[PDB]
């Protein structure tokens, strides 16, 4: 059998912008034999995620290698098994799925998923009922310091993306009385306020952010779910209250620069931080793998109850992996960027 796969073609440079050309699609034969403890899976969906930007650089786990197959989050279906708890027809996922239409994997690296949790919408396991959703829920639970009925105001940057779109709804579910998002287009702002329940949405590219935050957050900001960093965050931090908390989820505005992570705050912003006693600690969802079960069950519950709205942008075809990554990195996605493989 002949399958398609995607390999890393070129590096954009630690200070470069990633582009679709950094990837190349090829055709290869799929081995006709599977060893023991190994399974053959048909790839259904693949995720593209901002952390991948660092895997394209020569340094920072392992980076992708030129000419070798790329990998990342994926969901598929078992076609042939030689591993105990894995059977033809089982739906599985892995953080290291090769960007290839069909692949042979060691069952040990796979994890069975229950279609019932997502009402059969398997791509949701790569988003809101998956890692980004877990990141938002656990991040707010572990670093948000909210309380049922606090009347707190939360600001969310990267508000219309995978983590941000879920974080804002979760802020309201857990007690925030006001949730304001910051995103890059008016189309996203209207989606946030009209469908996801945000109280206000600011377009950082065209609106006066500072002024708009003053209007929409009349009582300051108690919680900042930060996905972008940079100048947007400085503006947000400026309007934050005493003893507030920044959930440091990501700093995507810095991912195409040669800087340390987490980026440090500018002198004046850091002074404000410390003076107001604002907490800003590193947060890595992988450090809470024991809350993954209850997180996923809670996220599923809220979705089944009609409370949690799940937005995704699906692109079709493996040949489009590089275009999807490039698109997500530049704001073309609303909600979770997904690639449908078959
Ligand atoms: N701490 C953890 O364990 C953890 C886990 C998963 C993800 N993350 C982090 O969370 C963030 C969001 O991840 P995601 O998967 O949900 O991706 P996403 O938000 O769905 O997609 C990226 C979005 O970032 C925005 N963006 C790109 N460049 C930007 C810039 N220079 N300035 C401002 N906004 C920019 C774009 O939308 P706009 O149109 O609004 O600009 C884009 O759609 C990333 O920073 C990621 O590294 C952290
Ligand atoms: C350089 O920075 C990285 C590298 C991998 C990361 C992350 C950040 C973040 C944090 C972020 O996006 O800032 C998350 C959540 N990662 C994973 O879940 C993950 C996915 C697949 C494999 Cl294999 C191993 C880890």
UniProtKB/Swiss-Prot annotation:
Substrate binds at residues 95-96, 284-286. Disulfide bonds: none annotated. One of its GO terms (cellular component) is cytoplasm. NADP(+) binds at residues 161-164, 188, 204, 227, 249-255, 283-285, 333. Its EC number is 1.3.1.48. This is Prostaglandin reductase 2. It is an enzyme of class 1 (oxidoreductase). It catalyses: 13,14-dihydro-15-oxo-prostaglandin E2 + NAD(+) = 15-oxoprostaglandin E2 + NADH + H(+); 13,14-dihydro-15-oxo-prostaglandin E2 + NADP(+) = 15-oxoprostaglandin E2 + NADPH + H(+); 13,14-dihydro-15-oxo-PGF2alpha + NADP(+) = 15-oxoprostaglandin F2alpha + NADPH + H(+); 13,14-dihydro-15-oxo-prostaglandin E1 + NADP(+) = 15-oxoprostaglandin E1 + NADPH + H(+). Belongs to the NADP-dependent oxidoreductase L4BD family. It holds the Pfam family ADH_N_2. InterPro entries: ADH-like_C, ADH_N_2, GroES-like_sf, MDR_fam, NAD(P)-bd_dom_sf, PTGR2.
């Amino acid at each position: 059998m002949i399958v398609q796969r995607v390999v890393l073609n070129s590096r954009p440079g630690k200070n470069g912008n990633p582009v679709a050309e950094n990837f190349r699609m090829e055709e290869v034969y799929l081995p006709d034999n599977i060893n023991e403890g190994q399974v053959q899976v048909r790839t259904l969906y693949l995720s593209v995620d901002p952390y991948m930007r660092c895997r394209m650089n020569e340094d920072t786990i392992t980076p992708w290698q030129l000419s070798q197959v790329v990998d990342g989050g994926g969901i598929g279906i078992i076609e042939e098994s030689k591993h105990t708890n894995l059977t033809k027809g089982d739906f599985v996922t892995s953080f290291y799925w090769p960007w290839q239409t069909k692949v042979i994997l060691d069952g040990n690296s796979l994890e069975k998923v229950d279609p019932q949790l997502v009402d059969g919408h398997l791509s949701y396991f790569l988003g809101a009922i998956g890692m980004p959703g877990l990141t938002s829920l656990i991040g707010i639970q572990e670093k948000g310091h909210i309380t049922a009925g606090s009347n707190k105001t939360m600001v969310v940057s990267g508000a219309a993306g995978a983590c941000g779109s879920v974080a804002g709804q979760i802020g309201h579910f857990l007690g925030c009385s006001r949730v304001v998002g910051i995103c890059g287009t008016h189309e996203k702002c209207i989606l946030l306020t009209s469908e996801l329940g945000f109280d206000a949405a600011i377009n950082y590219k065209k609106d006066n952010v500072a002024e708009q935050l003053r209007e929409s957050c009349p009582a300051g900001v108690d919680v900042y779910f930060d996905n972008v960093g940079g100048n947007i965050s400085d503006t947000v931090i400026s309007q934050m209250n005493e003893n507030s908390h920044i959930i440091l989820c990501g700093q995507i505005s810095q991912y195409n620069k040669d800087v340390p992570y987490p980026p440090p705050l500018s002198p004046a912003i850091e002074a404000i931080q410390k003076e107001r006693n604002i907490t800003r600690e590193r947060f890595l969802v992988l450090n809470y793998k024991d809350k993954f079960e209850p997180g996923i069950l809670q996220l599923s519950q809220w979705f089944k109850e009609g409370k949690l709205k799940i937005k995704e942008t699906v692109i079709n075809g493996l040949e489009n992996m590089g275009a999807a990554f490039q698109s997500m990195m530049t704001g073309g996605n609303i909600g979770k960027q997904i690639v449908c493989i078959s």
